[PDB]
Amino acid sequence: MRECISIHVGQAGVQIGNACWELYCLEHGIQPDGQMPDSFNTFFSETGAGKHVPRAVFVDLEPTVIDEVRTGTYRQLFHPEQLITGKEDAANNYARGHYTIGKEIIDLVLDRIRKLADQCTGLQGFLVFHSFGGGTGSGFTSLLMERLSVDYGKKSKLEFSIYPAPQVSTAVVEPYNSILTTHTTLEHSDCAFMVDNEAIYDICRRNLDIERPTYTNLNRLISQIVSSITASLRFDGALNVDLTEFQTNLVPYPRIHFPLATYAPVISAEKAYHEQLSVAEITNACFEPANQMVKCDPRHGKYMACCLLYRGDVVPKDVNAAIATIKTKRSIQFVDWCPTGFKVGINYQPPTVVPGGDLAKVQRAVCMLSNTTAIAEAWARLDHKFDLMYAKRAFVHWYVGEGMEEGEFSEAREDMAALEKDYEEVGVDSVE
Amino acid sequence: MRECISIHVGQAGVQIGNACWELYCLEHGIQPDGQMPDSFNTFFSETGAGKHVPRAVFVDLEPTVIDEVRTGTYRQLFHPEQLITGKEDAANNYARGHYTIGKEIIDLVLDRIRKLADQCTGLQGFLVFHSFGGGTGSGFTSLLMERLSVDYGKKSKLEFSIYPAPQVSTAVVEPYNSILTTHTTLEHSDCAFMVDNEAIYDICRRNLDIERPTYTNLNRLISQIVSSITASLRFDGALNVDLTEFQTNLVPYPRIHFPLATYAPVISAEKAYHEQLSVAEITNACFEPANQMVKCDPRHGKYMACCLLYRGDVVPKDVNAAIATIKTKRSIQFVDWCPTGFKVGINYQPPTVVPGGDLAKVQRAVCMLSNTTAIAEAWARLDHKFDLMYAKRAFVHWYVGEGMEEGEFSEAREDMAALEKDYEEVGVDSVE
Amino acid sequence: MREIVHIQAGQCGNQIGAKFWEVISDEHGIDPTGSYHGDSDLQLERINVYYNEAAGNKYVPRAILVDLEPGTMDSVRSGPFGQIFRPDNFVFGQSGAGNNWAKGHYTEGAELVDSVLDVVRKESESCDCLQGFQLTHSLGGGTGSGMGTLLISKIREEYPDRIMNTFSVVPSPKVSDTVVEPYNATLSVHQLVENTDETYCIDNEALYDICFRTLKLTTPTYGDLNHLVSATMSGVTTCLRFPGQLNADLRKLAVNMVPFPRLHFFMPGFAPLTSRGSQQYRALTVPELTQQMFDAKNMMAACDPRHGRYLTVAAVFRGRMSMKEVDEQMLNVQNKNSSYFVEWIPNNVKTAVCDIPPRGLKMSATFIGNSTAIQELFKRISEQFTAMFRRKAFLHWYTGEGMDEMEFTEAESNMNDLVSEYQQYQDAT
Amino acid sequence: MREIVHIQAGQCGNQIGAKFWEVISDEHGIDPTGSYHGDSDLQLERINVYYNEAAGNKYVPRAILVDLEPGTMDSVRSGPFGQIFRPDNFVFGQSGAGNNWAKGHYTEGAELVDSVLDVVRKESESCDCLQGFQLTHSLGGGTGSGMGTLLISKIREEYPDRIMNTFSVVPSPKVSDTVVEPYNATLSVHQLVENTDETYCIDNEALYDICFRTLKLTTPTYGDLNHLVSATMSGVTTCLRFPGQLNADLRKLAVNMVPFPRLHFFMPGFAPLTSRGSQQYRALTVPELTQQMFDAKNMMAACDPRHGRYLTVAAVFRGRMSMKEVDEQMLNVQNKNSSYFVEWIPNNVKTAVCDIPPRGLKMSATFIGNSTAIQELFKRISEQFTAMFRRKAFLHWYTGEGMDEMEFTEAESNMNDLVSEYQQYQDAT
Numbered sequence A, B: 001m002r003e004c005i006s007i008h009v010g011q012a013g014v015q016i017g018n019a020c021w022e023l024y025c026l027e028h029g030i031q032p033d034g035q036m037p038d039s040f041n042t043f044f045s046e047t048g049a050g051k052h053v054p055r056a057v058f059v060d061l062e063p064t065v066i067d068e069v070r071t072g073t074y075r076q077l078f079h080p081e082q083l084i085t086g087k088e089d090a091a092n093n094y095a096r097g098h099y100t101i102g103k104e105i106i107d108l109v110l111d112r113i114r115k116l117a118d119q120c121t122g123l124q125g126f127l128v129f130h131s132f133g134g135g136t137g138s139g140f141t142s143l144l145m146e147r148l149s150v151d152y153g154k155k156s157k158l159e160f161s162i163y164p165a166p167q168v169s170t171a172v173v174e175p176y177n178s179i180l181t182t183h184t185t186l187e188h189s190d191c192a193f194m195v196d197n198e199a200i201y202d203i204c205r206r207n208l209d210i211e212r213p214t215y216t217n218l219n220r221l222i223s224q225i226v227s228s229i230t231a232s233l234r235f236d237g238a239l240n241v242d243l244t245e246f247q248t249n250l251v252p253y254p255r256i257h258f259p260l261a262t263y264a265p266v267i268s269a270e271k272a273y274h275e276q277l278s279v280a281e282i283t284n285a286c287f288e289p290a291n292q293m294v295k296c297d298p299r300h301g302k303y304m305a306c307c308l309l310y311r312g313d314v315v316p317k318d319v320n321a322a323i324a325t326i327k328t329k330r331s332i333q334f335v336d337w338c339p340t341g342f343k344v345g346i347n348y349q350p351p352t353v354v355p356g357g358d359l360a361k362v363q364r365a366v367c368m369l370s371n372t373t374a375i376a377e378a379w380a381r382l383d384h385k386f387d388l389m390y391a392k393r394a395f396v397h398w399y400v401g402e403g404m405e406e407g408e409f410s411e412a413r414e415d416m417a418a419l420e421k422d423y424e425e426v427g428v429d430s431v432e
Numbered sequence C, D: 001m002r003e004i005v006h007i008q009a010g011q012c013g014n015q016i017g018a019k020f021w022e023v024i025s026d027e028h029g030i031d032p033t034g035s036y037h038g039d040s041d042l043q044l045e046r047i048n049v050y051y052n053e054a055a056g057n058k059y060v061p062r063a064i065l066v067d068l069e070p071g072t073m074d075s076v077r078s079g080p081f082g083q084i085f086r087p088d089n090f091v092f093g094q095s096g097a098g099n100n101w102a103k104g105h106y107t108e109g110a111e112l113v114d115s116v117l118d119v120v121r122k123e124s125e126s127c128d129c130l131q132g133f134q135l136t137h138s139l140g141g142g143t144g145s146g147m148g149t150l151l152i153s154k155i156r157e158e159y160p161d162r163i164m165n166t167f168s169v170v171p172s173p174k175v176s177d178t179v180v181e182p183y184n185a186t187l188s189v190h191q192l193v194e195n196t197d198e199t200y201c202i203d204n205e206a207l208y209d210i211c212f213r214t215l216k217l218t219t220p221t222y223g224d225l226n227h228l229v230s231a232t233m234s235g236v237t238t239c240l241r242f243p244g245q246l247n248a249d250l251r252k253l254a255v256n257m258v259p260f261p262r263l264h265f266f267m268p269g270f271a272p273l274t275s276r277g278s279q280q281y282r283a284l285t286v287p288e289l290t291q292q293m294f295d296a297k298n299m300m301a302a303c304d305p306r307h308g309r310y311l312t313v314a315a316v317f318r319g320r321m322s323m324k325e326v327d328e329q330m331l332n333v334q335n336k337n338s339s340y341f342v343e344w345i346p347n348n349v350k351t352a353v354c355d356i357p358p359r360g361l362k363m364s365a366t367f368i369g370n371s372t373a374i375q376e377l378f379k380r381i382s383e384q385f386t387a388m389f390r391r392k393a394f395l396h397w398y399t400g401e402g403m404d405e406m407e408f409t410e411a412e413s414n415m416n417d418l419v420s421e422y423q424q425y426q427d428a429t
């Protein structure tokens, strides 16, 4: 009787969520029409008749990709009041996402949410899926997450934001949106998870043996990560994990709260054989620097805390056998002040296969949610990209004339550099 | 064995009543020919043969829209003595409705009524449906309601008058009819209910998802309100309500007796799913300021008294659960002197669907009959519209030459402003 | 011997009795036809108290049903057990209340009461030795209140010695049915403190709590709510219709529970209460009945006895049980709760033991409790009363039926004197 | 007589008891329905200590189960033996812990404990002469720790004379479940040293060793791990539910094992332990039980007794055995291990002999051992504790629930004083 709604913002919000809600409907025997031939009380509010609806909110400022849902396969599955659309887009502007277009529909978005928390009773926390790049994923989320701390506050809020790549940047002004959206979400979102696109392209080439992935293949492996976290709600396990526990074990200080995810094993169907897929085999694939989903070599930095989730037929003894190996490897090191940086999670059910996917029906899977100091190296380049574009005052005039004071950049730069030195304190060891 | 006749005055009277008597004939298995293949003793006097007739009176000064009844579907259903017509119309004049054309047929209207009360024995009260705008709805009603207090007096008289809109005024001289018809009905009609057109247009667009409604779609949702009040007569319920109780719980002072109605839930057939329609879900939709049917934001004013009616399969326990929520919300406030401002009504039968309608076959429905101080804000603008037109003495000469002294405006303005300060006394709280 | 005439008044006054006569019929084994199809012999030994024997081996209840409209009376005769009553006894008016105490007691109540006092006086004479009357009504509405209190003013004048008790329904604290229920309460309570010998204050707020928390029911209807009130009502006169090892009656409950003739507002209690899934694991023995009664949530009044003090406690048990196992519990609740009882009345626990259980359950009990906890009840009415009276809101409806303002003063000032009386014995030495 | 009320707390606190009540049910012969289908007569002679008799020849456990979420409570009622408990006793919250000792003991623990102390106090009074309470929880999580220690602070205040013992689970040395378990340990240990009369420190690191090395199991689940802890728990009170030739109980194990009222942290041990392929060749006689206990690897604590010294040793045997064959072994382990025992307590071996064996095995034993070996345990916590506290990492989560830094100082300084006390008696003369 514990529930958790999910918000999806913009085109980054919807297309990730489409494969996600595809996966949830398969793991509970849910037809797309809502019929089915308890356990599933978490993500579905049951109607009086034999029909189920998700506890979902899809919001976008531009009505293009929303119409895929109202015409596609998953058409009769949603309440059409929950598919909030817009007329004009933010168009990669933080100002249009937060000031111009945001202040006209934000009341309609908040009003549908407060209807959802009333019919729930086990309201644990929130999920917001967006990107740092686009204006809707940056601006509209920044206005939304401020209202939640005003409204709810004590409920633990999570974000799977698409952190921008080091090199493969689709949009141009991503060093402007990503700084300003960080200066808002730092105070309100207690925990956020970063996943980069570029490393997934490296994973899809090297291990999936698919040279040509679309956004669909990226949306499958992200959807495994979402289901692997909320698995302790949808099924009983031997050792459960709750969404309030993630902000406890992964926030050592209230500024630095940016871990990163890695899913394992990632193998194809014709390569599903030829290896036994033991728990000790797959756990070395977790901490391997090549197999991560964020382009940050963790051997540059230091692991602050780690949170492992196992699902399937998982031996409780061999998990104790696996971690005893990794605490002895010299190549992986932890921070000096933290001796015990693990959080173990066991659940009985395996992740199923999506029909027409690429991963095979494995018996076990790991979602590594670890936090490191190696991510700060990515911040220094992104802040160095910010200083280059701002020095020539390029692309600023699009932002000034849309309800934004020019001095807001010089303030938001200083708090970012204040976050930059916060990693430098954790990096050094103890005194004496 | 308790009966209640209904009077319909003018084109506002008949076209509302056409959908209403359509709905009553469906909820008792009544063919339009009067045949049918106890409970229905309230609104029908049974003939000796197998044929039923309504206890209705349709009156209009102009014979246009009456001929729809004598030629349309409901043709053999009425006694043709009850369809009183006229030759010339009032034509949006209060004087022709009350002095010229009124004094020539008012005796024929009163004579048919006194035949109706003799064949009845459980005469409870009266229903008069008209508008403040048109001359027939203003003038002919004002002469009629005076005669009833002369004749009956102690019988409780109700009115569903169409209160004029703030902005969408079809007729031009509505600030002249609405003031003068209020100066007559204030003394005689103990209780009257206001319903505006404009908010129904807002309801039909936003929730019914019908961009193009005619007067038919407005006539359906008003007809639900009429059947939801008289449901305790036509069916036995767990907790009944009588037409003498409405003037008790909703008249705190004998001047201010103007509540306003709101029906809920209002959903379409393809949106009939995707929500469970619980009693706690629909009751928050009642006090929502967007869902009302009178363009007056209730958060501007204060709720004096409220009267809720539930019909269908209604849990008696959850009604106690629903009201316990609303007494705790800060956005809705009551007046300081009234601690206990609720009147609960439960009946077993649901409201049925009209064939070819838009609302779906729900299991429960609410008619909120609440009275507020927020309606006085509408009176101040309507009295300010009155002072503008009277200052230039425009449109007065049509009224002087039809049996009306010019000084009657200056008297009727003062009693209206006397009503205007009566809301100001109730608005302040107690002393010490 | 010792017959009782039952009177009903109001829509709430009707539906309780329809549930109540349903229970009493099964306690003797009376069919919905009206004949006898019982099994044992003690079912018929005291049948004459709530029934008059008719010919052809058929029995009729000694009931009187009063309402101002033909609506609620139509619902009673059409449901189950709608044939058991004599059709002459159904008195019904045609005007209707209007939910108005002024109309209930002066205008339309005075016209119909003459048609009631014929049927009342006829049923009193046909019995050998009348014991007393009991009335089921409410205080919120008009017909339950104004027509209700008018009878009690006329009953006591023609029969002073006969006892007179009321199963009224005091309105709830949180939700409120009638807007003018503070006017309805204060005018009715002023009549209850003159012509009633005791009062059983029952609150619907307690009934929604019991049916949800203890019975574990998702959608409890009034048929489940009004079922528990009838079990209390039957549990009061259960020693009069059956023999017992210590026989109490209405008069023994009158004198033992009333120390002073004003202080006669009581709260009930019932035990056991087993839910559907919880019925088999609970060991249903005699001390398990004791610890279920004396808490707050099992009372049918919406006031905790912890705020006040008890004066007298009646216990009416039902079933083949031993006295030592009863007396050990009744002594023990005095000792550890020595603060909650009052000091200057020693042995303030009245015990009554019947023999025959109700249907299905192997044993049962019925709690009657007097307390100073009800001073929060009347003050919550009295605070809401003057808050409406200071602005003269809703006043002209009562005034328009020929009622002076001095009536409200003599009603309300007599209430606060009673509240001071409960305030006096709360902190006495 | 001498009844015991069992309390559970946390997800680890639930699953042990579900395994534990599975064992106790088979020790008397109680079906998964709840009735009795046993064979002998001594099964029912002392049944009333862990059960209250209900009617219809059905029995219920005297259990109390507490967790902050409806998840783990749903798993217990849905598995086997999910019908034996009374459904009223399942107390469960809706907020959840968050794996936080601050939330477990101050914010949400304080709101739910009032709903627990009703059910605790009801089960205490219904028993004739209460013996004492036992608690199964953990120290790592939030609901096992904060909600756990809050009860023990409230149990001792309402019942000082009753004994109070804990089957906690101290976290392992190598692997670590909770990152903030040093904060969770130090704040919970400060409550355990005030309101508990003894503590049974069990480590999961020992359990993965025993199920792999001795039982020879490839994939041992928690059902195999938690099975051995229950056999220790049943082996402590095995002389209370059965007659014996030397009857010990909780109080005899209280006084004999505790020399000083602070030093009350104990380690358990179980014997015999035969694997599947190794069960027939091992001669299972009385001295073979003796040499299996006193080594390092058969302890359920993750600390070698060779580093420290024993203070008191309890031995609770089960089965028809001779005393001379027992006393020869208990004398002999004193002599050759004269260094490992302490000098200034002569005869530091307590012997307890039951009669009836557990199911299947012909005889059994249960080891309770006090030692100074546990000073390595708390110092390994205390070294990890200040290593996190010097940087104030993970501090604001506890601080944000209204908790001062002085609480951590008074917790940690009281720990090191206890560590110095074990350091004192290790090298005394």
Ligand SMILES: Nc1nc2c(ncn2[C@@H]2O[C@H](COP(=O)(O)OP(=O)(O)OP(=O)(O)O)[C@@H](O)[C@H]2O)c(=O)[nH]1
Pocket: A009, A010, A011, A012, A013, A015, A016, A061, A062, A089, A090, A091, A092, A093, A131, A133, A134, A135, A136, A137, A138, A162, A164, A170, A171, A197, A215, A216, A218, A219
């Ligand atoms: N993981 C993932 N990233 C995507 C997908 N589609 C787009 N992106 C990312 O989205 C970012 C571009 O921003 P958008 O989300 O398209 O923009 P927006 O938030 O919708 O707002 P507008 O600029 O108004 O369209 C880039 O970082 C892309 O990598 C997808 O299906 N999956």
Ligand SMILES: Nc1nc2c(ncn2[C@@H]2O[C@H](COP(=O)(O)OP(=O)(O)OP(=O)(O)O)[C@@H](O)[C@H]2O)c(=O)[nH]1
Pocket: B009, B010, B011, B012, B013, B015, B016, B061, B062, B089, B090, B091, B092, B093, B131, B133, B134, B135, B136, B137, B138, B162, B164, B170, B171, B197, B215, B216, B218, B219
């Ligand atoms: N709700 C509703 N209002 C209507 C309808 N038809 C007209 N009105 C309202 O009626 C008012 C105009 O009054 P009329 O009824 O046409 O005039 P009349 O009372 O017949 O008087 P005459 O024109 O002299 O005959 C306006 O406020 C219209 O909005 C209808 O079908 N439904």
Ligand SMILES: Nc1nc2c(ncn2[C@@H]2O[C@H](COP(=O)(O)OP(=O)(O)OP(O)(O)=S)[C@@H](O)[C@H]2O)c(=O)[nH]1
Pocket: B238, B239, B240, B241, B242, C009, C010, C011, C012, C013, C015, C016, C096, C097, C098, C099, C100, C138, C139, C140, C141, C142, C143, C144, C145, C169, C171, C177, C178, C204, C222, C225, C226
């Ligand atoms: N216990 C109980 N109380 C009820 C029931 N129905 C209504 N009530 C309560 O009784 C009061 C309404 O009584 P009611 O009999 O209808 O008034 P009346 O004046 O006598 O009758 P009416 O003219 O107004 S329809 C309210 O306080 C309401 O909460 C019921 O089934 N059970």
Ligand SMILES: Nc1nc2c(ncn2[C@@H]2O[C@H](COP(=O)(O)OP(=O)(O)OP(O)(O)=S)[C@@H](O)[C@H]2O)c(=O)[nH]1
Pocket: A238, A239, A240, A241, A242, D009, D010, D011, D012, D013, D015, D016, D096, D097, D098, D099, D100, D138, D139, D140, D141, D142, D143, D144, D145, D169, D171, D177, D178, D204, D222, D225, D226
């Ligand atoms: N012996 C044993 N220990 C267990 C078992 N499951 C978990 N543990 C241990 O208990 C601790 C986890 O207990 P847990 O009850 O879940 O914490 P909680 O706060 O009370 O519950 P939660 O809110 O966090 S889900 C860890 O130290 C873990 O190693 C089990 O089945 N057996």
Ligand SMILES: [Mg+2]
Pocket: A010, A011, A012, A062, A134, A136
């Ligand atoms: Mg976009």
Ligand SMILES: [Mg+2]
Pocket: B010, B011, B012, B089, B134, B135, B136
């Ligand atoms: Mg007209």
